[PDB]
Amino acid sequence: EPHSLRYFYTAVSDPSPGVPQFVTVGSVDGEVFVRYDSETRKMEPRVDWIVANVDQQYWDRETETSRGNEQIFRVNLDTARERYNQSRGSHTWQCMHGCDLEDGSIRGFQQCGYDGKDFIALDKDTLTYTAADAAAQITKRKWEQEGTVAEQWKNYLENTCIEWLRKYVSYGKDVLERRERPKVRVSGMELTLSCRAHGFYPPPISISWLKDGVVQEQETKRGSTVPNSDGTYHAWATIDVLPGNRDKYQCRVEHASLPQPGLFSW
């Protein structure tokens, strides 16, 4: 059901391995589909469905715009450093924007952060920017005084962003709307029982531990759901139990790919 389009922009004053001076990543339903950085200087596909569906003009325009954004982000690091009276050093500037389509309604956001703390965010309902502190109030004033900044962002988030998200979902439908069943294995140590689900899609899942059919919530440990390299996901749940109550315990897995919850034993 729900879909999202998001762009993540990261600029750093001190690059390091794995961390270019500037990177932009676009994601649809949480999966990266395009990436640009200051070293390749090209917007590049990271999934097949995007290449097979847009023209070379898409790549050229995205590459030109990203080359322009690189410069802006370089300037914004400088401005932020001076607003906070900071010496040269290691700093980060990040911005994220995007839209969600759910049921009939639309959500959109645009927000930036400096050294990992909020700086400024759009309030799309009031067409104002919310400033985290005095430094960010100067930016609030600049963007609100310009007279068109919040309105252009409102337009992009509610219109342009949603229009592209619909096109993306349509291009990727076979990937994005597929269902892949979890492959589940139960293990145990010294007794710690572990129910691990491998390779499911989409990411929502519910793994519960039952003692003779009884949902043991308060005693269930759970990881964060995490991706595999092929765009499928992984999740686990453990239970700390007394050695040799073993027969009693079953793992239940609820997932869209499974018409009925799966039940698994050690």
Partner: peptide
């Protein structure tokens, strides 16, 4: 598709 302003 990826508005980006100076702060």
């Amino acid at each position: 598709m990826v508005l980006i302003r100076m702060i």
